[PDB]
C-alpha cells in the first residue's frame, strides 16, 4: 500500500502509571506547537514533509492494548527504572510479536530520579537494556528521561521523525480500518428524550488508514461493542 500517507500511529504503552502516559503525552505536545493540558484520545501532530504523526494514551485495559497492538505503526515502550519490568509491557510486547511486527519499536524509560547511586542506575540500565534486547530485537534503541527535559525528547524526536517504511504487514495491507478521532452523537430529541435507550446514530470521524472502503453499504467492526453497518459516509476535504 503506497499511499500518500495518513498520520502514522504511535503507541505509548506501559504499566498503570497514568501520569507516565500523560506525562510523555503532554511532553511531546510541548515539543510540538501546543501547550494544552487535557488529552483527547487520538491526537494528530503535524511533523514534516513526509508524514505527520498521531499520539494516543493506551489505558490500563489490555483489551485496548491488543486493539491498538493491531493498530500500531510505530511503538513507544514506556518502562520503569527501579522496578525492572511489569507484566503489561511483556504482554503487549509478545502480543505484538504475535499480532504483527512493526518497523520500529523503541524503549523509553522513566523514574530515573528515584535512585540513590549512579552505579545502581547504570547497572539496572544495562540489565534492563539486555532484557529488552532478548525480548524484542538484538540492539534496539532504549531511552531515558529523568521529569521534563527537552534535549532527550529532542533526539527522541530525531528518531521518530525519520520514518523509514511501515513494513508491509498483510492484514494492514488488505483490511480497512480507522481510529475514531471525533465522537459525534446524532439523535432526534424525542428519540433520545422520549426513549431512554433505543438506539442512536453516531458520526465517528477519523483518518482512513487501511485499504479502500466500500463505496456503498459497508459492514464494519467496532471494538468492544461489536460489528455494525455504516449508515453514511461523508468526507472532509484537504488541501
Amino acid at each position: 500500500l503506497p499511499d500518500e500517507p495518513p498520520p502514522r500511529l504511535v503507541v505509548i504503552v506501559g504499566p498503570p502509571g497514568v501520569g507516565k502516559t500523560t506525562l510523555l503525552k503532554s511532553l511531546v505536545r510541548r515539543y510540538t506547537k501546543e501547550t494544552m493540558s487535557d488529552p483527547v484520545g487520538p491526537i494528530t501532530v503535524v511533523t514534516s514533509k513526509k508524514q505527520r504523526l498521531t499520539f494516543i494514551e493506551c489505558p490500563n485495559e489490555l483489551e485496548a492494548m491488543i486493539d491498538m497492538a493491531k493498530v500500531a505503526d510505530i511503538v513507544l515502550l514506556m518502562i520503569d527504572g527501579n522496578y525492572g519490568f511489569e507484566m503489561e509491557t511483556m504482554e503487549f510486547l509478545n502480543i505484538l510479536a504475535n499480532t504483527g511486527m512493526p518497523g520500529n519499536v523503541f524503549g523509553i524509560l522513566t523514574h530515573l530520579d528515584l535512585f540513590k547511586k549512579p552505579s545502581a542506575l547504570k547497572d539496572a540500565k544495562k540489565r534492563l537494556k539486555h532484557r529488552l534486547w532478548t525480548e524484542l530485537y538484538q540492539g534496539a534503541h532504549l531511552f531515558y528521561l529523568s521529569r521534563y527535559p527537552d534535549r532527550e525528547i529532542h533526539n527522541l524526536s530525531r528518531f521518530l521523525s525519520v520514518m523509514k517504511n511501515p513494513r508491509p504487514l498483510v492484514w494492514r495491507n488488505t483490511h480497512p480500518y480507522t481510529i475514531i478521532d471525533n465522537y459525534r452523537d446524532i439523535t432526534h430529541p424525542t428519540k433520545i428524550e422520549e426513549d431512554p435507550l433505543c438506539d442512536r446514530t453516531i458520526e465517528l470521524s477519523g483518518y482512513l488508514r487501511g485499504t479502500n472502503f466500500a463505496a456503498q453499504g459497508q459492514r464494519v467492526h467496532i471494538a468492544g461493542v461489536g460489528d455494525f453497518t455504516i449508515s453514511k459516509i461523508e468526507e472532509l476535504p484537504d488541501p
Binding site: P15, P16, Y83, G84, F85, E86, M87, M90, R131, T134
Partner: protein, 74 residues
Amino acid sequence: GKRQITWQIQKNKGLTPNRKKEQRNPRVKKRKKYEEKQKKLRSVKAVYKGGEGPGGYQGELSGIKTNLVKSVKL
C-alpha cells in the same frame, strides 16, 4: 499494587536440558572426575600407598594367587 514479573519471565530459560550441581562449577566437576580416575587406576595397576602401617604386616590381605605371573617378559 504493581504486577511483579516472575523468574522465568526475567530469565527465559525455556526448555533447557537438566544439568547437574557438579556441572554448575567446573572446578568441582574436574575434582570429582580426578577422584574417580584416581580410583580406577587402583583397580588396574598397583599403587604403593605406604608400606607396613601401624600394625606391622597382618599378612598378605586380599589373598595370594600362586599360578598368576604378573610380569613383563624382557
